[PDB]
């Protein structure tokens, strides 16, 4: 669970830092 | 990966940026 | 413009939960 | 796109599943 | 429609924090 | 309802407390 | 704290998966 | 409950769905 | 009014991540 | 990471409880 | 501080309120 | 203000950095 929860913050942070570019995510 | 790199310890903005595109 | 920036944030959130081990690309 | 489809209409989890992978 | 879907997400969030051990029902 | 009250006006934590239990 | 934080992700996930139906939550 | 079932270990969409209504 | 309440929530979120050890004030 | 993640919930909770007043946050 | 006080153990609404302004 | 600037236009992380400290 601790890493599923971290992942969720990670994508949110990616969403903002990546901008126009977007990003890719896989667990 | 990002879960490996950024969940055991904080990632800077620049570190997170390696996962853009 | 903002409307959609904020919706995008919820969308990534939802794709996170839904996609599981698949993962996903997101672009704006 | 996903923004065009799911920021205008509400998208359920089954709709959203089509943008996975 | 979306406006309210996204607001609902914040509302559950806020009800979570506010209700404490009470908990809550939410329906759209 | 809560959507009708708090998505049109801002609801404080005291307003919201009335939908707990 | 770890479970208060998990709860918060739980309700968000419930919000999405439950849809029209809505859900109930208690800690 | 859900905190017992889904915080010590991941719940699928279907598992989470037991807590709808 | 709501539009901006909900945007504020994302803004604090983003300021959290961006500011780092600086931290921040937020007022509505 | 566990406290960076908690911080993020903290600011969100501050945002709501503080209202008009707003708040200050530093890690 | 708040991270010290509210991350090792839950803070009530009133406890969190010490960090307003 | 930040609401007036970043709730009307999208603000990047560099814009937002100017409201830190
Ligand atoms: Cl929103
Ligand atoms: Cl978390
Ligand atoms: Zn939102
Ligand atoms: Zn979290």
Curated annotation (Swiss-Prot), chains B, D, F, H, K, L:
Name of the protein in question: Insulin A chain
Entry superkingdom: Eukaryota
Disulfide-linked positions: 6-11
Species in which this protein is naturally found: Homo sapiens (Human)
